[PDB]
Design an enzyme around this catalytic site. Structure first.
Site, PDB file in Angstrom:
ATOM      1  CB  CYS A  56      -1.731  -9.304  -0.012  1.00  0.00           C
ATOM      2  SG  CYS A  56      -0.398  -8.090   0.039  1.00  0.00           S
ATOM      3  CG  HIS A  88      -0.486 -12.891  -4.401  1.00  0.00           C
ATOM      4  ND1 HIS A  88      -1.572 -12.418  -3.697  1.00  0.00           N
ATOM      5  CD2 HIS A  88       0.549 -12.078  -4.085  1.00  0.00           C
ATOM      6  CE1 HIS A  88      -1.211 -11.364  -2.988  1.00  0.00           C
ATOM      7  NE2 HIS A  88       0.072 -11.137  -3.205  1.00  0.00           N
ATOM      8  CD  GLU A 131       1.288 -16.487  -7.637  1.00  0.00           C
ATOM      9  OE1 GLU A 131       1.333 -15.268  -7.905  1.00  0.00           O
ATOM     10  OE2 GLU A 131       0.233 -17.079  -7.323  1.00  0.00           O
ATOM     11  CE  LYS A 136      -3.476  -9.162  -5.831  1.00  0.00           C
ATOM     12  NZ  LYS A 136      -3.943 -10.579  -5.791  1.00  0.00           N
ATOM     13  CG  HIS A 162      -2.884  -5.828  -4.297  1.00  0.00           C
ATOM     14  ND1 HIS A 162      -3.682  -6.405  -3.331  1.00  0.00           N
ATOM     15  CD2 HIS A 162      -1.610  -6.158  -3.976  1.00  0.00           C
ATOM     16  CE1 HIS A 162      -2.924  -7.055  -2.466  1.00  0.00           C
ATOM     17  NE2 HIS A 162      -1.662  -6.919  -2.834  1.00  0.00           N
ATOM     18  CG  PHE A 222       3.250  -6.611   1.247  1.00  0.00           C
ATOM     19  CD1 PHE A 222       2.071  -5.999   0.858  1.00  0.00           C
ATOM     20  CD2 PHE A 222       4.282  -6.716   0.327  1.00  0.00           C
ATOM     21  CE1 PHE A 222       1.917  -5.502  -0.424  1.00  0.00           C
ATOM     22  CE2 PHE A 222       4.140  -6.217  -0.957  1.00  0.00           C
ATOM     23  CZ  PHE A 222       2.954  -5.610  -1.334  1.00  0.00           C
TER      24      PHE A 222
HETATM   25  C1  LIG Z   1      -7.826   5.716   3.063  1.00  0.00           C
HETATM   26  C2  LIG Z   1      -8.353   4.854   4.206  1.00  0.00           C
HETATM   27  N1  LIG Z   1      -9.200   5.247   5.142  1.00  0.00           N
HETATM   28  N2  LIG Z   1      -9.422   4.216   5.968  1.00  0.00           N
HETATM   29  C3  LIG Z   1      -8.721   3.130   5.584  1.00  0.00           C
HETATM   30  C4  LIG Z   1      -8.619   1.820   6.114  1.00  0.00           C
HETATM   31  C5  LIG Z   1      -7.800   0.882   5.496  1.00  0.00           C
HETATM   32  C6  LIG Z   1      -7.077   1.231   4.346  1.00  0.00           C
HETATM   33  N3  LIG Z   1      -6.229   0.232   3.721  1.00  0.00           N
HETATM   34  S1  LIG Z   1      -5.194   0.614   2.419  1.00  0.00           S
HETATM   35  O1  LIG Z   1      -4.281  -0.491   2.139  1.00  0.00           O
HETATM   36  O2  LIG Z   1      -4.264   1.681   2.796  1.00  0.00           O
HETATM   37  C7  LIG Z   1      -6.170   1.066   0.950  1.00  0.00           C
HETATM   38  C8  LIG Z   1      -5.617   0.394  -0.303  1.00  0.00           C
HETATM   39  C9  LIG Z   1      -6.710  -0.381  -1.037  1.00  0.00           C
HETATM   40  C10 LIG Z   1      -6.911   0.133  -2.460  1.00  0.00           C
HETATM   41  F1  LIG Z   1      -7.903  -0.567  -3.080  1.00  0.00           F
HETATM   42  C11 LIG Z   1      -7.175   2.522   3.820  1.00  0.00           C
HETATM   43  C12 LIG Z   1      -8.010   3.476   4.450  1.00  0.00           C
HETATM   44 NA    NA Z   2      -5.367 -15.599  -6.406  1.00  0.00          NA
END
Ligand SMILES: Cc1n[nH]c2ccc(NS(=O)(=O)CCCCF)cc12
Ligand code: NA
Ligand SMILES: Cc1n[nH]c2ccc(NS(=O)(=O)CCCCF)cc12
Ligand code: NA
Lengths: 414, 414
Positions: B169, B309, B320, B338, B343, B402
């Site tokens: 994050c 955050h 936080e 958020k 997020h 994280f």
């Molecule tokens: C699906 C996918 N295909 N390719 C990727 C590459 C990176 C991530 N990251 S994530 O954290 O799992 C998505 C969470 C964010 C929501 F807004 C996901 C994908």
């Molecule tokens: Na912030």
């Protein structure tokens, strides 16, 4: 203008090193094997080579596999690079006397080429088979590519920053660069830094060999990796992981630690030329060497030794030869350790940094294997035949990774 | 001791911003939507939610999908985050007047949470079906998580460093932190920095919701993300990508660029406490805020605004709140974006940095949505109900990812 030589930056020293290698799980045994002309590259006895009939059938697996040091708990709680990072993190700390440092002044910077990729396809199948609730609550902390650095910081108690740079072949060197920055800027006094990388498998081989980037001399595995040689064929995979302990000289003397070498400066530039191929003129790669000298306080004349990137691709070594010439270090004694240890992507920059430190400590450069017919276009003083004992005072370790990422680390004898 | 206020560091300013968001593909339209109390979180109409019957059925897809701006060439030549990075990179450069900078003084630092993961399983199937020669020669440059930053550096011509930090994050904020470091240390005069992240899918939802980390209030999607509210339930996914252009004030005035705000300092610490959960005492997270003030030259009293955050997990907001109190910024006006944008992991730190800059520029803080019953244990001055117009001179953007990665960016009104 601040510099290491004029006191603008605090003096940073290397106090402990650890590495696992296709030659040995012990860095001192790997060093002695390199000096005796040993190679870690052999014929791949893995069944995936016969299954898909790969163009390449050679490579260097770790002499001592990481998972032979791992119980059932670690085999499900961590990804491969996390398990390698925990193993190396623990060995490095004991090798350094298991010191008790201030956690708020202790940083960790560990690079990797990709991360916990095998855990993504595993969670992919685990939910296709049983549903979303069959994905482990530990899946996030295993998949995230910051995971290896995260377990090392948690295991050793580093609270001044845990960072993961990603830049392919330069990831491990860039990690050491940022750890040096975190210290000279005052955010930390001691840092564990290096790189980890996954093992040789079929998909990595297929992806890189379809770029025509890998050697295919399967009849003589130990002679395939030929950096700066006229019969170049590409690089060969060689598994590795490496970590080093760096700290301010003030911090090392107050705990009774014997420094192995000095970390003097670090230069990071980029080519912005091509997604995988290096710029032929080597201008930006050479500027990274120059930049490490500027921060260190050196001139090209002071550089006795260059630990080359030397992957043994035709265009790679040609570009680096130009880069070394652009930086003005063409008179330096050049070593290409990938001739014996192969290419470990995210870890090799850290491994070759350890080898640079050992070269300055013992005043000796191992021979570049398979250097028998010098390329007419590469006029460099490469060490070959037998180890060259010399009075090496300052050295530069080069790492030019795919994507145009140039890292140069300037090291000095302690 | 060097600092921004006492001239030890050169003055760095933000001159252009760009972001794509679940509210709008235009950052100025996203800003105006936030000020009008809009939310990007809706019911997920994707078929994978009905297929696996997910615990969460809410989230914010981008208002304007990235692939609606992509032809067939880009759909096979790049991964998703690379395509998002090319889109944002091009929009940012035009928004800045398409300046002609010295490539050797131009850096790129773009973080991401994971990288081109979807391309690994694609190459996995492409060779299982046809063999190793059916894997594209472009597979390496698509899979490597440095890929997004690599295409942005290549597209814009950045030759002073192309870097990719990975810290979940906090990846997007850490990218801006390292870009600030690359400038104040003299390696560059201008930098593109931010974060990109992949879209919402079934596997990411399953992994995070099995940690009990995600909200499950599927009946009122716009009311699920409730940072610092007593009825907290966890975080909600909201897709985003964001980039900003920073440069020395000297460099901006010589090209006639109107700065949006000042980037004053950046603090990076780590918890070393748990692989996914933040430390309850918030000591190390608060130290990151303190460290950004030290490098900037500020005191806790000067901080009028904190962009929190604020993920809306029970333990996250509690930690936080302690962190803000530890840093001594408890009297500051707090915003948790958020609540409306969700997020976006590797990108959200960059997005919230853009929102911090806009808050200092317009002297207004959007309301934290769904903040209706204050948690008794969190006594913070959070903006709610309607936008709060105020004389905000300095602000801190928080990102605690994280793994225990704490990044704090100190910003000042121009
Ligand atoms: C699906 C996918 N295909 N390719 C990727 C590459 C990176 C991530 N990251 S994530 O954290 O799992 C998505 C969470 C964010 C929501 F807004 C996901 C994908
Ligand atoms: Na912030
Ligand atoms: C396989 C595998 N499982 N998990 C991984 C994580 C990372 C990487 N990296 S790599 O470049 O493809 C390996 C090349 C290094 C050879 F010494 C590979 C794997
Ligand atoms: Na090297």
């Amino acid at each position: 203008q601040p510099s290491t030589a004029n006191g603008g930056f605090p003096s940073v020293v290397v106090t402990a090193v650890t590495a696992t290698t296709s030659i040995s799980p012990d860095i001192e045994s790997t060093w002695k094997g390199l000096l005796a002309g040993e190679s870690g590259i052999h014929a791949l006895e893995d069944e995936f080579v016969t299954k898909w009939d790969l163009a390449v059938k050679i490579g260097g697996h770790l002499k001592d596999p990481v998972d032979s040091h791992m119980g059932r708990l670690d085999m499900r709680r961590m990804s491969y690079v996390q398990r390698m990072g925990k193993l190396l993190g623990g060995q490095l700390w004991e090798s350094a006397g298991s010191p008790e440092v201030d956690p708020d002044r202790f940083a960790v910077v560990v690079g990797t080429g990709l991360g916990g990729a095998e855990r993504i396809v595993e969670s992919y199948d685990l939910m296709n088979a049983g549903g979303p609730r069959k994905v482990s609550p530990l899946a996030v902390q295993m998949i995230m590519p910051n995971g290896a650095a995260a377990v090392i910081g948690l295991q050793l108690g580093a609270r001044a920053g845990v960072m993961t740079p990603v830049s392919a072949c330069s990831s491990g060197s860039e990690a050491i660069a940022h750890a040096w920055r975190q210290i000279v800027m005052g955010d930390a006094d001691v840092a564990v830094c290096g790189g980890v990388e996954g093992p040789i498998e079929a998909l990595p081989i297929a992806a890189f060999s379809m770029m025509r980037a890998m050697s295919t001399r399967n009849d003589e595995p130990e002679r395939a990796s030929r950096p700066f040689d006229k019969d170049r064929d590409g690089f060969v995979f060689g598994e590795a992981g490496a970590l080093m302990l760096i700290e301010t000289e003030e911090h090392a003397k107050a705990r009774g630690a014997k420094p192995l070498a000095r970390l003097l400066g670090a230069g990071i530039t980029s080519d912005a030329f091509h997604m995988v191929a290096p710029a032929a003129d080597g201008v930006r790669a050479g500027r990274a060497m120059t930049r490490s000298l500027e921060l260190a306080g050196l001139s090209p004349a002071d550089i006795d030794h260059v630990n080359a990137h030397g992957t043994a691709t035709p265009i790679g070594d040609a570009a680096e030869a130009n880069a070394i010439r652009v930086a003005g270090c063409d008179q330096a004694a050049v070593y290409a350790p990938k001739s014996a240890l192969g290419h470990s992507i995210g870890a090799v920059g850290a491994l070759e940094s350890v080898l640079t430190v050992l070269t300055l400590r013992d005043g000796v450069i191992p021979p570049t294997l398979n250097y028998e017919t010098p390329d007419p276009e590469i006029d460099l003083d490469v060490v070959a035949g037998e180890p060259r004992y010399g009075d090496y005072r300052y050295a530069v370790n080069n790492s030019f990774g795919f994507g145009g990422h140039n890292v140069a680390l300037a090291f000095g004898r302690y």
